[PDB]
Design a protein around this nucleic acid. Structure first.
Ligand SMILES: [Mg+2]
Ligand SMILES: [Mg+2]
Ligand SMILES: [Mg+2]
Ligand SMILES: [Mg+2]
Ligand SMILES: [Mg+2]
Ligand SMILES: [Mg+2]
Ligand SMILES: [Mg+2]
Ligand SMILES: [Mg+2]
Ligand SMILES: [Mg+2]
Ligand SMILES: [Mg+2]
Ligand SMILES: [Mg+2]
Ligand SMILES: [Mg+2]
Ligand SMILES: [Mg+2]
Ligand SMILES: [Mg+2]
Ligand SMILES: [Mg+2]
Ligand SMILES: [Mg+2]
Ligand SMILES: [Mg+2]
Ligand SMILES: [Mg+2]
Ligand SMILES: [Mg+2]
Ligand SMILES: [Mg+2]
Ligand SMILES: [Mg+2]
Ligand SMILES: [Mg+2]
Ligand SMILES: [Mg+2]
Ligand SMILES: [Mg+2]
Ligand SMILES: [Mg+2]
Ligand SMILES: [Mg+2]
Ligand SMILES: [Mg+2]
Ligand SMILES: [Mg+2]
Ligand SMILES: [Mg+2]
Ligand SMILES: [Mg+2]
Ligand SMILES: [Mg+2]
Ligand SMILES: [Mg+2]
Ligand SMILES: [Mg+2]
Ligand SMILES: [Mg+2]
Ligand SMILES: [Mg+2]
Ligand SMILES: [Mg+2]
Ligand SMILES: [Mg+2]
Ligand SMILES: [Mg+2]
Lengths: 260, 188, 155
RNA sequence: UGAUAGAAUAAUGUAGAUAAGGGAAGUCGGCAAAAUAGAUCCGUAACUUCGGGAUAAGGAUUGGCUCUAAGGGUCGGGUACGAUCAACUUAGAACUGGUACGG
RNA sequence: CGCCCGUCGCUAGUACCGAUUGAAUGGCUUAGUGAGGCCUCAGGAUCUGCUUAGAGAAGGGGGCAACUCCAUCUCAGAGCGGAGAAUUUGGACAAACUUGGUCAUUUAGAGGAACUAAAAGUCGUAACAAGGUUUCCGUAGGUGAACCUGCGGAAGGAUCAUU
RNA sequence: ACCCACUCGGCACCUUACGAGAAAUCAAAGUCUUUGGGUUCUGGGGGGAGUAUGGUCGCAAGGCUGAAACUUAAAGGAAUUG
RNA sequence: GGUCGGAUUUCCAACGGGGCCUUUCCUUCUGGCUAACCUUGAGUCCUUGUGGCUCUUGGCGAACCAGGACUUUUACUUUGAAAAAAUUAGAGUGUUCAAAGCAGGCGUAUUGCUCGAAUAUAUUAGCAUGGAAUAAUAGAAUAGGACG
RNA sequence: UAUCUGGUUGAUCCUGCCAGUAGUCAUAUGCUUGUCUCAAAGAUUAAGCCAUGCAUGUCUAAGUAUAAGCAAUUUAUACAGUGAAACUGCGAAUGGCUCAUUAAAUCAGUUAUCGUUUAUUUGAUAGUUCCUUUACUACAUGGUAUAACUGUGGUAAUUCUAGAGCUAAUACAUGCUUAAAAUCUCGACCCUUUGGAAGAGAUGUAUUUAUUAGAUAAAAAAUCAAUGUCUUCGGACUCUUUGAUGAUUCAUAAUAACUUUUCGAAUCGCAUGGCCUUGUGCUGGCGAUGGUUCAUUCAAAUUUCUGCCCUAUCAACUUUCGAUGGUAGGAUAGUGGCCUACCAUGGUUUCAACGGGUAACGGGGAAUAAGGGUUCGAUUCCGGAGAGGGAGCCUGAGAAACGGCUACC
């Protein structure tokens, strides 16, 4: 009450951070920034819990203050910086590049990319609008304001951002048959192609998606993120490619590759 | 202070609602401006998020639009002659939105005579050519030209002085002018 | 509403920021703004070719329709431009595996483009707060016959 | 315009009044006096023979002035209707004053 | 030689009615008075800026004899403007107190009238047998007490029964 | 009018116990642990008590509505033997 | 059973979904689909089969996009989604066991490799969807009816 | 884990309770108590009262350093290191505690904002600063006025402060300097008119109002104010810029004005490269901090539907001092009887309104349980409320804040 909250109690953090129940009353509260709180991954969680480069927050701050980490090509000394979907994390030391893509269990995966992949990201067009002086601009899913977009670009399309200059390189429409990535809900992390899109004027457009093995699912349009054409994504997919194995077959391959 | 919420009211069934919490600042209201005429005096208000409001207290002139001519002029306000909400606002010459007033006719008459060459009521080659090109447009309306003899045009306030510190408005024309004429602004 | 005292109040009634030019005499003398509220609701011809104002109208007024679309039965047309509808529903009580009849009374603004009688089934659309109690506008009426064609005097 | 007049202004009287603080301690007894009081609005208990009790109890208002709003009569039609006349009741608002006003 | 009813009587306990304008606490509230800040009509200690502004004397340059221009130490005082405290008018918000009203809970009470328990008290024997007047129901009257009596009803009767 | 044979409706009766019930008994008190045709009312150990209180109806007598504190291991039903 | 009683398959059977025909709505007009091509100019070079063809004879262009001469309403049920985490049930894992916890495991410990942190349930209301039995509701009777 | 046993009788079978029986993250208490791990804990009664101490402050290369501070410093005679104090900035609205209020209220799930505010984060964004320009003001950089400090004090006492003297800024006020034309307004200068031009002004962004554009269905014309730019001078003319939404008076743009005129860098660290009219000249990097507006993030406020325990010995309630709706206005960040004026007579209710009770904060949940259920949830998470009781307000993006203030009790 009376103003914005600054603390995030442990057990109230997003579950996909995979923070331990005990060993702490609190969790890193993501700073304000490009991604929403529940959909973000604070830099301390990435550096400490996921990459194990730091044993505690003090080491995370020690790493960040020497300006090693950078999100989308900028240093980001902030410990609780809200990195999110398709953010590029570069460590000049270790010469390592990461893109934040959910694995098929709805959690950010430690996914490595090359320098050429790290040169760009993808953004989902959140809105297209005329600004002052009648200058058109698009707004992406990470809050980027990009002036003078291609007129063919509409909402729910995807743009390729140069990430050195905040410029669109090309774009993908939102049409049936195009590869998409599920960025929300219970199907988060799944990858498939749009079968069709049902409108529901006045609320909650839905999208029908089938994956490689012809498993279909329906998701709200807000969770659907276009990532390429039929096959051949514009980003390097993580291991699994969003197939969503069942628990029985998941177990089958566990016992398969654990016994050589 | 003044509380602008609905907890103090009865429910739609008539039930007496009990007190839920103390008064909050985010549901407040202020005292009315009760803007008068004369010797401009405007006090700023600090509102939510900063966002200055301007309380008009006894200001003099305003910007009034002649929509048929598509011009706006700074003009002195004479008095309030009609108010649909309260006849006491007319009585006290209080300026709110929608109050009918008379203003000057004076800057509007110089503009009209410089723009048409007609002398509402009763030298250059460029000026003459402009007037000739603007001919067949000077005839405005008998009910408006009649006011120019008295040097007082009927106008409606379209601004909220207690919110913005401005008495802006528009001259009355057509059915709106006839409505207020039949209603009260005749009969002296 | 071409007649019956549109200008029946101390202020002149008009659609805001719609200007009738006294000079250019187009053969209608009245520019009437209107919109389609959307969601497949047809704008009544009564709204298009009427002369009422109703700033709370979803076709000629400033309000907009967004949110819940509900149906109800008109139980009161006694207020001016406001009806009350009765929304009945069955409430399930799990312990007995049975339902009980329950109802709600919804106060709804009705545009003078619509004529509604107690008993008419009405489709109402959510808008911003109009009154203390009103949060809906009538967007559709379903009084076709009324079963009153065979209840008259017979020779 | 009648009732004897004039002068003076002791006590005690008769009639009329006023009173600091207290407030029935006076007295057989609140005797006597005081307090209340019109009107408008609000509120009104026990009990009851349901008719009352009731102006219960209890409380606000009240001037002047300047306005506003309601309430009326006659005279009138095509083998989208206005003149004109007149009355005192009620209600409200502004202003005003040594907060006074059923003076 | 069973069982069993009530009055009356001692003990104890529980509540009930109860003169006392009983009392106590709390909730809401009519009217009256009304702190405080806030808005507003004003007020204007001081605390200051420009153009100035006039006098008593100095330095410097100039007809070099007085005379003249700019600079400084002194103070009024005024056209000017801004800021501005005490104080202050009227409003809305409104604490709080006084009285009164009302609702709620708890509680004292002479005395009255009950119930229950408590073993072995007094008077009768009302019920259970046709309980010695069959019992019981409603209603009404009467009597120490159980009860009696009338009027209608029931059999749960002591009669399933008189073509 | 009576006789016979049917039929609908009714007051009942007799036999039997399918079935039910603790039994007495019951053609409904049956079609119930193989538990559901529709629907209204009422009860939840015995007393305190149909008392107290409030309300309401009544001229009254009284009626309708109607507790609690407290107390208690039984009260009760049907049948068996004496 | 040609891998010392375990693929394959109109031999089929038994379940379960869809389309079509039998008098059989699946409303609708604008225009890009150009039919599992209604109709096989040119061509059946596989030793015989009813499981595999090329620029097509203006070719019902009815195999989806966004606007109606466009909308009977409702209950019910199906699926989907949503219903924070912890908790509940539950998968994995020798916290020495266990309650727990979300860890951990394997090497070449010579310069690191790797599995996880699942899943279900979460009731009503709202949302999308299939169904059309059950139970309501509405329709053409002074025809003010539909088709056109 | 779908289980019953004792008790009415002389015995019987029933009804029926009493009693036993087993759990309880369910409290207390009695007796007893060796080990390891785990770890609730002044909720209930008194949101009763509190001694004391602590719980909110914060400085980087990067706002202000003349401490008469320490080290003394890297040309370092403007400063340069560290740096108390004190200005400035940010924070103190989070957390933590409690459950007193509170019964469609809180709250849960689900909606909306086309009905608003939003510090910070992130992204994007500012050549226009000219009273009436034919009256431009240092820009190699405006001004005073204050803290800490000096010194003189008052009070028993306070995180009290007074008088006098200094001096800074990213404090506080002021104030310029940057293309290029275009399009409009006005106007000395066109002789029989389908007769145009020197020359000034305006045009950034905010504010307020008015007005305008913000289109759209596939075919054609014949005359009429329309020889308004129709070329063998009646040779049937090469046309339509314009985004989004389910939807708008939306985004945005245009015109005439308006304003106690908003913003448009007088700031700081490091490095100090390049160039030629070598003037301590012109250009120049990597950051810091500011700032308008729009987006975003964090939110906030309001808001749609359905859902809450006992009670009728609570049946009618609201409407005088708003109850229910309309119009207008005011107020607000904004919608709305939120308030005001006028107007209308509405609104809820046996489908339980209104009232009363609660040893009620709501939910996630907990205990027990064959299934259905029953009871609990002050309490580790979410939401709400409060800080003895009321009310009021200041600063702030944000509080009706209480380790802020004001008043009353
Ligand atoms: Mg808090
Ligand atoms: Mg405003
Ligand atoms: Mg005499
Ligand atoms: Mg006296
Ligand atoms: Mg006295
Ligand atoms: Mg006496
Ligand atoms: Mg005496
Ligand atoms: Mg007397
Ligand atoms: Mg009396
Ligand atoms: Mg009285
Ligand atoms: Mg007897
Ligand atoms: Mg006897
Ligand atoms: Mg006898
Ligand atoms: Mg009996
Ligand atoms: Mg019979
Ligand atoms: Mg019982
Ligand atoms: Mg009983
Ligand atoms: Mg274990
Ligand atoms: Mg029992
Ligand atoms: Mg040991
Ligand atoms: Mg306590
Ligand atoms: Mg505690
Ligand atoms: Mg603390
Ligand atoms: Mg702060
Ligand atoms: Mg505690
Ligand atoms: Mg801030
Ligand atoms: Mg700094
Ligand atoms: Mg209104
Ligand atoms: Mg309004
Ligand atoms: Mg409580
Ligand atoms: Mg709870
Ligand atoms: Mg709780
Ligand atoms: Mg409590
Ligand atoms: Mg608080
Ligand atoms: Mg306390
Ligand atoms: Mg406070
Ligand atoms: Mg404290
Ligand atoms: Mg605090």
């Amino acid at each position: 009450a009376r103003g914005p909250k600054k603390h995030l109690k442990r057990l109230a953090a997003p579950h996909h951070w995979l923070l331990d129940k005990l060993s702490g009353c609190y969790a890193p509260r993501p700073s304000a920034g490009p991604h929403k709180l529940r959909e973000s991954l604070p830099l301390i969680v990435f550096l400490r819990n996921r990459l194990k480069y730091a044993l505690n927050g003090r080491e995370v701050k020690a790493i960040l203050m020497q300006r090693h980490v950078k999100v989308d090509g900028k240093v980001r000394t902030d410990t609780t910086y809200p990195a999110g979907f398709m953010d590029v994390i570069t460590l000049d030391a270790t010469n390592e590049n990461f893109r934040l893509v959910y694995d098929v269990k709805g959690r950010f995966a430690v996914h490595r990319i090359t320098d050429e992949e790290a040169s760009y990201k993808l953004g989902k067009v959140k809105k297209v609008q005329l600004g002052k002086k009648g200058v058109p601009y698009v707004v992406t899913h990470d809050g980027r304001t990009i002036r003078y977009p291609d007129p063919n670009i509409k909402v729910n399309d995807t743009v390729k951002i140069d990430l050195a200059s905040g410029k669109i390189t090309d774009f993908i429409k939102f049409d049936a048959g195009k590869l998409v990535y599920v960025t929300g809900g219970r199907n988060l992390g799944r990858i498939g192609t749009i079968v069709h899109k049902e409108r529901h004027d006045g609320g909650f457009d839905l999208v029908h998606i089938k994956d490689s093995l012809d498993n279909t699912f329906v998701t709200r349009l807000n969770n659907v993120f276009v990532i390429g054409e039929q096959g051949k994504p514009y980003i390097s997919l993580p291991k699994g490619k969003g197939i969503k194995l069942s628990i029985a077959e998941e177990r089958d391959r566990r016992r398969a590759q654990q016994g050589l | 202070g003044i509380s602008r919420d609905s907890r103090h009211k009865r429910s739609a069934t008539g039930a007496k609602r009990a007190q839920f919490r103390k008064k909050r600042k985010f549901e407040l209201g202020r005292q009315p401006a009760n803007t008068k005429i004369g010797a401009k005096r405007i006090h700023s208000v600090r509102t939510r998020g900063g966002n200055k409001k301007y309380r008009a207290l006894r200001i003099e002139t305003g910007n009034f639009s002649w929509a048929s001519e598509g011009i706006s002029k700074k003009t002195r306000i004479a008095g309030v002659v009609y108010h649909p909400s309260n006849n006491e606002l007319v009585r006290t010459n209080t300026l709110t939105k929608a109050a009918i007033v008379q203003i000057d006719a004076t800057p509007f008459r110089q503009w009209f005579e410089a723009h048409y060459g007609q002398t509402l009521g009763k030298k250059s080659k460029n000026a003459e050519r402009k007037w000739a090109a603007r001919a067949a447009s000077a005839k405005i309306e008998s009910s408006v030209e009649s006011q120019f003899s008295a040097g007082r045009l009927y106008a409606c306030i379209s601004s909220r002085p207690g919110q913005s510190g401005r008495c802006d408005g528009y001259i009355l024309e057509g059915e709106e002018l006839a409505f207020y004429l039949r209603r009260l602004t005749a009969k002296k | 509403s071409t007649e019956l005292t549109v200008q029946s109040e101390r202020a002149f009634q008009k659609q805001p920021h719609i200007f009738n030019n006294p000079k250019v005499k187009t053969s209608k003398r009245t520019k009437r703004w209107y919109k389609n509220a959307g969601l497949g609701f047809k704008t009544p011809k009564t709204a298009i070719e009427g002369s009422y104002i109703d700033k709370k109208c979803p076709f000629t007024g400033l309000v907009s329709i967004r949110g819940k679309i509900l149906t109800g039965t008109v139980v009161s047309t006694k207020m001016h431009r406001t009806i009350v509808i009765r929304r009945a529903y069955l409430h399930y009580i799990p312990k007995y595996n049975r339902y009980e009849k329950r109802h709600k009374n919804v106060p709804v603004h009705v545009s003078p483009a619509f004529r509604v009688q107690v008993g008419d089934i009405v489709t109402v659309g959510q808008c911003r707060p109009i009154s203390k109690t009103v949060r809906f506008n009538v967007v559709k009426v379903s009084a076709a016959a009324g079963k009153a064609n065979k209840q008259f005097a017979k020779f």
